[PDB]
Amino acid sequence: GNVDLVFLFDGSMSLQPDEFQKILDFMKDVMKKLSNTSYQFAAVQFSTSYKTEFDFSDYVKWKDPDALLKHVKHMLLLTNTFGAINYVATEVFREELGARPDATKVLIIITDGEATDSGNIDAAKDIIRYIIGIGKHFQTKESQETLHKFASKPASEFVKILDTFEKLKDLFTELQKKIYVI
Ligand SMILES: CC[C@H](C)C(=O)O[C@H]1C[C@@H](C)C=C2C=C[C@H](C)[C@H](CC[C@@H]3C[C@H](CC(=O)NC)N(Cc4ccc(O)c(OC)c4)C(=O)O3)[C@H]21
Ligand SMILES: [Mg+2]
């Protein structure tokens, strides 16, 4: 059917400029690959605060991933992931901003650290949640486990741990092998 996908991307101060850019490039690559399909996209940057960089109605109107992410500015603050998930669930998946009432709701969280806030994400229960944890902060098994609370079940399928930012390329390769005409 229809899929309404939101990229929720980390803009924290731990990210070097080239690392932030690789996150952007990954999102653009996925959008370009899936252009003119059944998929619709929205992108939200999160750090201490949250900002919708473009919503579903923007994507439908302009279509161009490069133009849609052209004026993103790296926030450079903390990682309030609990707050960001709640933000998306109540402020982005809304019919007024172009969300389709009959689409499947998907959230892709891209982060390089553990959350600096706390709370619950009960508001996002109906949303399918993928988490991609990248880098040094996720070496220990204990740090990886913290991400499980954000992801859909089972974690083994919805949590992806990449050791370097270069590995987003490999993830994109993997995704492309699962594309089919149905
Ligand atoms: C597909 C492998 C790829 C590496 C991956 O995980 O892609 C994820 C994360 C990230 C890399 C980017 C992505 C971009 C677009 C779609 C939403 C990817 C996930 C696709 C899956 C597809 C899939 C539904 C389906 O098979 N459609 C025909 N589901 C539900 C689901 C999830 C896990 C399952 O084991 C499952 O069993 C049938 C069904 C989903 O929730 O989304 C997503
Ligand atoms: Mg960080």
PDB file of C-alpha atoms and ligand atoms in Angstrom:
ATOM      1  CA  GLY A   1       0.000   0.000   0.000  1.00  0.00           C
ATOM      2  CA  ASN A   2       1.060   3.549   0.825  1.00  0.00           C
ATOM      3  CA  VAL A   3       4.033   4.279   3.141  1.00  0.00           C
ATOM      4  CA  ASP A   4       4.548   7.665   4.825  1.00  0.00           C
ATOM      5  CA  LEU A   5       8.201   7.664   5.944  1.00  0.00           C
ATOM      6  CA  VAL A   6       9.863  10.177   8.330  1.00  0.00           C
ATOM      7  CA  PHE A   7      13.600  10.541   8.695  1.00  0.00           C
ATOM      8  CA  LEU A   8      14.372  11.645  12.247  1.00  0.00           C
ATOM      9  CA  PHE A   9      18.038  12.629  12.146  1.00  0.00           C
ATOM     10  CA  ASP A  10      20.575  13.489  14.885  1.00  0.00           C
ATOM     11  CA  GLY A  11      22.098  16.956  14.759  1.00  0.00           C
ATOM     12  CA  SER A  12      24.065  16.750  18.022  1.00  0.00           C
ATOM     13  CA  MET A  13      27.438  18.374  18.755  1.00  0.00           C
ATOM     14  CA  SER A  14      29.193  14.966  18.710  1.00  0.00           C
ATOM     15  CA  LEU A  15      28.902  14.947  14.905  1.00  0.00           C
ATOM     16  CA  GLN A  16      31.786  16.222  12.804  1.00  0.00           C
ATOM     17  CA  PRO A  17      30.744  18.163   9.676  1.00  0.00           C
ATOM     18  CA  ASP A  18      31.530  15.287   7.316  1.00  0.00           C
ATOM     19  CA  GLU A  19      29.568  12.852   9.474  1.00  0.00           C
ATOM     20  CA  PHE A  20      26.487  15.099   9.431  1.00  0.00           C
ATOM     21  CA  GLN A  21      26.835  15.392   5.629  1.00  0.00           C
ATOM     22  CA  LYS A  22      26.933  11.593   5.256  1.00  0.00           C
ATOM     23  CA  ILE A  23      23.657  11.384   7.160  1.00  0.00           C
ATOM     24  CA  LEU A  24      22.156  13.908   4.669  1.00  0.00           C
ATOM     25  CA  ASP A  25      23.542  12.043   1.648  1.00  0.00           C
ATOM     26  CA  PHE A  26      22.087   8.739   2.874  1.00  0.00           C
ATOM     27  CA  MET A  27      18.625  10.311   3.150  1.00  0.00           C
ATOM     28  CA  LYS A  28      18.912  11.884  -0.289  1.00  0.00           C
ATOM     29  CA  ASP A  29      20.035   8.573  -1.834  1.00  0.00           C
ATOM     30  CA  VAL A  30      17.039   6.719  -0.423  1.00  0.00           C
ATOM     31  CA  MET A  31      14.666   9.469  -1.597  1.00  0.00           C
ATOM     32  CA  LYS A  32      16.132   9.559  -5.092  1.00  0.00           C
ATOM     33  CA  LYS A  33      15.980   5.758  -5.411  1.00  0.00           C
ATOM     34  CA  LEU A  34      12.328   5.725  -4.334  1.00  0.00           C
ATOM     35  CA  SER A  35      11.239   8.799  -6.330  1.00  0.00           C
ATOM     36  CA  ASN A  36       7.869   8.601  -8.171  1.00  0.00           C
ATOM     37  CA  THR A  37       6.740   5.696  -6.062  1.00  0.00           C
ATOM     38  CA  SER A  38       4.128   5.044  -3.460  1.00  0.00           C
ATOM     39  CA  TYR A  39       6.442   6.346  -0.740  1.00  0.00           C
ATOM     40  CA  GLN A  40       6.106   9.898   0.657  1.00  0.00           C
ATOM     41  CA  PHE A  41       8.804  11.472   2.875  1.00  0.00           C
ATOM     42  CA  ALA A  42       9.312  14.009   5.633  1.00  0.00           C
ATOM     43  CA  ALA A  43      12.536  14.889   7.496  1.00  0.00           C
ATOM     44  CA  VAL A  44      13.025  16.128  11.030  1.00  0.00           C
ATOM     45  CA  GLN A  45      16.296  17.207  12.554  1.00  0.00           C
ATOM     46  CA  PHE A  46      16.642  16.760  16.311  1.00  0.00           C
ATOM     47  CA  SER A  47      19.199  17.755  18.925  1.00  0.00           C
ATOM     48  CA  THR A  48      18.109  19.711  22.009  1.00  0.00           C
ATOM     49  CA  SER A  49      15.173  20.967  20.089  1.00  0.00           C
ATOM     50  CA  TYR A  50      13.307  19.673  16.963  1.00  0.00           C
ATOM     51  CA  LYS A  51      12.816  21.124  13.541  1.00  0.00           C
ATOM     52  CA  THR A  52      10.779  19.881  10.588  1.00  0.00           C
ATOM     53  CA  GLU A  53      13.144  20.416   7.636  1.00  0.00           C
ATOM     54  CA  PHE A  54      10.402  19.454   5.154  1.00  0.00           C
ATOM     55  CA  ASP A  55       6.974  17.801   5.501  1.00  0.00           C
ATOM     56  CA  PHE A  56       4.971  15.431   3.262  1.00  0.00           C
ATOM     57  CA  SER A  57       3.215  18.298   1.459  1.00  0.00           C
ATOM     58  CA  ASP A  58       6.640  19.876   0.710  1.00  0.00           C
ATOM     59  CA  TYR A  59       7.917  16.606  -0.742  1.00  0.00           C
ATOM     60  CA  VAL A  60       4.838  16.100  -2.976  1.00  0.00           C
ATOM     61  CA  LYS A  61       5.042  19.695  -4.227  1.00  0.00           C
ATOM     62  CA  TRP A  62       8.783  20.042  -4.898  1.00  0.00           C
ATOM     63  CA  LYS A  63       9.933  16.385  -5.148  1.00  0.00           C
ATOM     64  CA  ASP A  64      13.617  17.362  -5.294  1.00  0.00           C
ATOM     65  CA  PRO A  65      15.659  15.916  -2.349  1.00  0.00           C
ATOM     66  CA  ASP A  66      18.568  18.249  -3.017  1.00  0.00           C
ATOM     67  CA  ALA A  67      16.361  21.338  -2.914  1.00  0.00           C
ATOM     68  CA  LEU A  68      14.361  20.016   0.103  1.00  0.00           C
ATOM     69  CA  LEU A  69      17.516  19.622   2.265  1.00  0.00           C
ATOM     70  CA  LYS A  70      19.486  22.545   0.863  1.00  0.00           C
ATOM     71  CA  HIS A  71      19.051  24.850   3.879  1.00  0.00           C
ATOM     72  CA  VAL A  72      19.552  22.387   6.698  1.00  0.00           C
ATOM     73  CA  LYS A  73      21.785  23.846   9.404  1.00  0.00           C
ATOM     74  CA  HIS A  74      23.528  21.503  11.881  1.00  0.00           C
ATOM     75  CA  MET A  75      22.048  22.225  15.349  1.00  0.00           C
ATOM     76  CA  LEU A  76      25.143  21.277  17.413  1.00  0.00           C
ATOM     77  CA  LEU A  77      23.489  20.635  20.781  1.00  0.00           C
ATOM     78  CA  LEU A  78      22.303  17.559  22.744  1.00  0.00           C
ATOM     79  CA  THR A  79      20.192  14.385  21.966  1.00  0.00           C
ATOM     80  CA  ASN A  80      16.648  14.533  23.280  1.00  0.00           C
ATOM     81  CA  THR A  81      15.378  11.417  21.451  1.00  0.00           C
ATOM     82  CA  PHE A  82      12.316  10.823  23.636  1.00  0.00           C
ATOM     83  CA  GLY A  83      11.104  14.350  22.939  1.00  0.00           C
ATOM     84  CA  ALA A  84      11.901  14.063  19.211  1.00  0.00           C
ATOM     85  CA  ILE A  85       9.888  10.834  18.774  1.00  0.00           C
ATOM     86  CA  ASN A  86       6.900  12.463  20.521  1.00  0.00           C
ATOM     87  CA  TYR A  87       7.272  15.515  18.335  1.00  0.00           C
ATOM     88  CA  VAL A  88       7.052  13.430  15.099  1.00  0.00           C
ATOM     89  CA  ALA A  89       4.097  11.358  16.320  1.00  0.00           C
ATOM     90  CA  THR A  90       1.983  14.428  17.212  1.00  0.00           C
ATOM     91  CA  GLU A  91       3.329  17.220  14.935  1.00  0.00           C
ATOM     92  CA  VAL A  92       4.491  15.580  11.695  1.00  0.00           C
ATOM     93  CA  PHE A  93       2.090  12.674  11.007  1.00  0.00           C
ATOM     94  CA  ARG A  94      -0.834  15.032  10.485  1.00  0.00           C
ATOM     95  CA  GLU A  95      -3.219  15.205   7.560  1.00  0.00           C
ATOM     96  CA  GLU A  96      -2.790  18.981   7.418  1.00  0.00           C
ATOM     97  CA  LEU A  97       0.902  18.549   6.608  1.00  0.00           C
ATOM     98  CA  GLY A  98       0.178  15.967   3.894  1.00  0.00           C
ATOM     99  CA  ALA A  99       0.186  12.686   5.820  1.00  0.00           C
ATOM    100  CA  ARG A 100      -2.180  10.109   4.229  1.00  0.00           C
ATOM    101  CA  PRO A 101      -4.793   8.666   6.611  1.00  0.00           C
ATOM    102  CA  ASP A 102      -4.470   5.211   5.033  1.00  0.00           C
ATOM    103  CA  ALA A 103      -0.687   4.981   4.792  1.00  0.00           C
ATOM    104  CA  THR A 104       1.563   2.804   6.877  1.00  0.00           C
ATOM    105  CA  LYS A 105       3.563   5.095   9.236  1.00  0.00           C
ATOM    106  CA  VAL A 106       7.311   4.487   9.300  1.00  0.00           C
ATOM    107  CA  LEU A 107      10.000   6.277  11.335  1.00  0.00           C
ATOM    108  CA  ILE A 108      13.715   5.978  10.617  1.00  0.00           C
ATOM    109  CA  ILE A 109      15.808   7.323  13.512  1.00  0.00           C
ATOM    110  CA  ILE A 110      19.460   8.039  12.708  1.00  0.00           C
ATOM    111  CA  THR A 111      21.556   8.798  15.818  1.00  0.00           C
ATOM    112  CA  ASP A 112      25.196   8.664  17.068  1.00  0.00           C
ATOM    113  CA  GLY A 113      24.543   8.673  20.823  1.00  0.00           C
ATOM    114  CA  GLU A 114      22.325   7.736  23.728  1.00  0.00           C
ATOM    115  CA  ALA A 115      19.360   9.950  24.609  1.00  0.00           C
ATOM    116  CA  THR A 116      19.916  12.900  27.002  1.00  0.00           C
ATOM    117  CA  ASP A 117      16.240  13.125  27.988  1.00  0.00           C
ATOM    118  CA  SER A 118      13.764  10.579  29.254  1.00  0.00           C
ATOM    119  CA  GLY A 119      10.095   9.702  29.253  1.00  0.00           C
ATOM    120  CA  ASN A 120       7.883   7.398  27.222  1.00  0.00           C
ATOM    121  CA  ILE A 121       6.945   7.082  23.553  1.00  0.00           C
ATOM    122  CA  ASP A 122       3.431   5.621  23.970  1.00  0.00           C
ATOM    123  CA  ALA A 123       2.244   8.202  21.423  1.00  0.00           C
ATOM    124  CA  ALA A 124       4.338   6.428  18.734  1.00  0.00           C
ATOM    125  CA  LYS A 125       3.014   2.903  19.372  1.00  0.00           C
ATOM    126  CA  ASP A 126       1.298   2.628  15.998  1.00  0.00           C
ATOM    127  CA  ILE A 127       4.390   3.796  14.111  1.00  0.00           C
ATOM    128  CA  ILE A 128       6.886   1.253  12.788  1.00  0.00           C
ATOM    129  CA  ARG A 129      10.280   2.304  14.167  1.00  0.00           C
ATOM    130  CA  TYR A 130      13.701   1.601  12.730  1.00  0.00           C
ATOM    131  CA  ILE A 131      16.768   2.848  14.577  1.00  0.00           C
ATOM    132  CA  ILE A 132      20.212   3.222  13.069  1.00  0.00           C
ATOM    133  CA  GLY A 133      22.919   3.778  15.708  1.00  0.00           C
ATOM    134  CA  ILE A 134      26.285   4.859  14.290  1.00  0.00           C
ATOM    135  CA  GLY A 135      29.786   5.100  15.723  1.00  0.00           C
ATOM    136  CA  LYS A 136      32.014   4.733  18.787  1.00  0.00           C
ATOM    137  CA  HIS A 137      29.268   5.441  21.344  1.00  0.00           C
ATOM    138  CA  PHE A 138      27.712   2.093  20.428  1.00  0.00           C
ATOM    139  CA  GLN A 139      30.718  -0.255  20.879  1.00  0.00           C
ATOM    140  CA  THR A 140      29.602  -1.867  24.161  1.00  0.00           C
ATOM    141  CA  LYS A 141      26.605  -4.183  24.038  1.00  0.00           C
ATOM    142  CA  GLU A 142      25.126  -2.133  26.895  1.00  0.00           C
ATOM    143  CA  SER A 143      25.056   1.074  24.853  1.00  0.00           C
ATOM    144  CA  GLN A 144      23.387  -0.754  21.925  1.00  0.00           C
ATOM    145  CA  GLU A 145      20.715  -2.083  24.240  1.00  0.00           C
ATOM    146  CA  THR A 146      19.601   1.422  25.162  1.00  0.00           C
ATOM    147  CA  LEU A 147      18.358   1.822  21.571  1.00  0.00           C
ATOM    148  CA  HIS A 148      15.990  -1.144  21.929  1.00  0.00           C
ATOM    149  CA  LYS A 149      13.457   0.953  23.800  1.00  0.00           C
ATOM    150  CA  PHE A 150      12.986   3.202  20.721  1.00  0.00           C
ATOM    151  CA  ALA A 151      12.612   0.438  18.127  1.00  0.00           C
ATOM    152  CA  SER A 152       9.765  -1.789  17.053  1.00  0.00           C
ATOM    153  CA  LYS A 153       9.866  -5.436  18.123  1.00  0.00           C
ATOM    154  CA  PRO A 154      11.799  -7.481  17.636  1.00  0.00           C
ATOM    155  CA  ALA A 155      14.935  -5.317  18.132  1.00  0.00           C
ATOM    156  CA  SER A 156      17.043  -7.799  16.087  1.00  0.00           C
ATOM    157  CA  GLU A 157      15.196  -6.675  12.993  1.00  0.00           C
ATOM    158  CA  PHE A 158      14.516  -2.982  13.769  1.00  0.00           C
ATOM    159  CA  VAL A 159      17.834  -1.941  15.302  1.00  0.00           C
ATOM    160  CA  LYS A 160      20.817  -1.422  13.016  1.00  0.00           C
ATOM    161  CA  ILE A 161      24.267  -0.710  14.483  1.00  0.00           C
ATOM    162  CA  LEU A 162      26.847   0.723  12.084  1.00  0.00           C
ATOM    163  CA  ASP A 163      30.438   1.017  13.340  1.00  0.00           C
ATOM    164  CA  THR A 164      31.368   3.924  11.030  1.00  0.00           C
ATOM    165  CA  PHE A 165      29.555   6.558   8.992  1.00  0.00           C
ATOM    166  CA  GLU A 166      31.068   5.038   5.847  1.00  0.00           C
ATOM    167  CA  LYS A 167      28.837   1.993   6.485  1.00  0.00           C
ATOM    168  CA  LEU A 168      25.654   3.925   5.507  1.00  0.00           C
ATOM    169  CA  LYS A 169      26.831   3.192   1.946  1.00  0.00           C
ATOM    170  CA  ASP A 170      26.682  -0.543   2.666  1.00  0.00           C
ATOM    171  CA  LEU A 171      23.271  -0.180   4.278  1.00  0.00           C
ATOM    172  CA  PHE A 172      22.028   1.600   1.095  1.00  0.00           C
ATOM    173  CA  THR A 173      23.437  -1.307  -0.960  1.00  0.00           C
ATOM    174  CA  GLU A 174      21.493  -3.723   1.207  1.00  0.00           C
ATOM    175  CA  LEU A 175      18.285  -1.759   0.828  1.00  0.00           C
ATOM    176  CA  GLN A 176      18.585  -1.696  -2.949  1.00  0.00           C
ATOM    177  CA  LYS A 177      18.754  -5.547  -3.134  1.00  0.00           C
ATOM    178  CA  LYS A 178      15.287  -5.614  -1.560  1.00  0.00           C
ATOM    179  CA  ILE A 179      13.592  -3.472  -4.170  1.00  0.00           C
ATOM    180  CA  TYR A 180      11.010  -5.303  -6.321  1.00  0.00           C
ATOM    181  CA  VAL A 181       8.254  -4.495  -8.737  1.00  0.00           C
ATOM    182  CA  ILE A 182       5.073  -6.033  -7.289  1.00  0.00           C
TER     183      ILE A 182
HETATM  184  C1  LIG B   1      15.037  -3.679   3.650  1.00  0.00           C
HETATM  185  C2  LIG B   1      16.445  -3.786   4.271  1.00  0.00           C
HETATM  186  C3  LIG B   1      16.900  -2.377   4.591  1.00  0.00           C
HETATM  187  C4  LIG B   1      18.371  -2.418   5.060  1.00  0.00           C
HETATM  188  C5  LIG B   1      16.012  -1.807   5.678  1.00  0.00           C
HETATM  189  O1  LIG B   1      15.917  -2.280   6.807  1.00  0.00           O
HETATM  190  O2  LIG B   1      15.363  -0.719   5.285  1.00  0.00           O
HETATM  191  C6  LIG B   1      14.634  -0.014   6.295  1.00  0.00           C
HETATM  192  C7  LIG B   1      15.565   0.891   7.154  1.00  0.00           C
HETATM  193  C8  LIG B   1      16.322   1.901   6.261  1.00  0.00           C
HETATM  194  C9  LIG B   1      17.614   1.272   5.695  1.00  0.00           C
HETATM  195  C10 LIG B   1      15.490   2.422   5.119  1.00  0.00           C
HETATM  196  C11 LIG B   1      14.271   1.991   4.795  1.00  0.00           C
HETATM  197  C12 LIG B   1      13.545   2.598   3.657  1.00  0.00           C
HETATM  198  C13 LIG B   1      12.360   2.154   3.280  1.00  0.00           C
HETATM  199  C14 LIG B   1      11.685   0.973   3.936  1.00  0.00           C
HETATM  200  C15 LIG B   1      10.622   1.503   4.929  1.00  0.00           C
HETATM  201  C16 LIG B   1      12.721   0.071   4.641  1.00  0.00           C
HETATM  202  C17 LIG B   1      12.026  -0.951   5.565  1.00  0.00           C
HETATM  203  C18 LIG B   1      11.024  -1.826   4.745  1.00  0.00           C
HETATM  204  C19 LIG B   1      10.170  -2.772   5.614  1.00  0.00           C
HETATM  205  C20 LIG B   1       9.248  -3.648   4.694  1.00  0.00           C
HETATM  206  C21 LIG B   1       8.313  -4.485   5.588  1.00  0.00           C
HETATM  207  C22 LIG B   1       6.966  -4.739   4.821  1.00  0.00           C
HETATM  208  C23 LIG B   1       7.129  -5.345   3.427  1.00  0.00           C
HETATM  209  O3  LIG B   1       7.842  -6.331   3.319  1.00  0.00           O
HETATM  210  N1  LIG B   1       6.544  -4.722   2.370  1.00  0.00           N
HETATM  211  C24 LIG B   1       6.264  -5.451   1.133  1.00  0.00           C
HETATM  212  N2  LIG B   1       8.068  -3.896   6.909  1.00  0.00           N
HETATM  213  C25 LIG B   1       7.248  -4.575   7.895  1.00  0.00           C
HETATM  214  C26 LIG B   1       8.031  -5.821   8.256  1.00  0.00           C
HETATM  215  C27 LIG B   1       9.193  -5.673   9.002  1.00  0.00           C
HETATM  216  C28 LIG B   1       9.964  -6.778   9.347  1.00  0.00           C
HETATM  217  C29 LIG B   1       9.544  -8.041   8.937  1.00  0.00           C
HETATM  218  O4  LIG B   1      10.285  -9.167   9.275  1.00  0.00           O
HETATM  219  C30 LIG B   1       8.385  -8.201   8.175  1.00  0.00           C
HETATM  220  O5  LIG B   1       8.036  -9.513   7.804  1.00  0.00           O
HETATM  221  C31 LIG B   1       7.205  -9.704   6.651  1.00  0.00           C
HETATM  222  C32 LIG B   1       7.622  -7.084   7.835  1.00  0.00           C
HETATM  223  C33 LIG B   1       8.498  -2.656   7.212  1.00  0.00           C
HETATM  224  O6  LIG B   1       8.163  -2.098   8.256  1.00  0.00           O
HETATM  225  O7  LIG B   1       9.304  -1.969   6.414  1.00  0.00           O
HETATM  226  C34 LIG B   1      13.612   0.905   5.582  1.00  0.00           C
HETATM  227 MG    MG B   2      25.675  12.591  19.300  1.00  0.00          MG
END
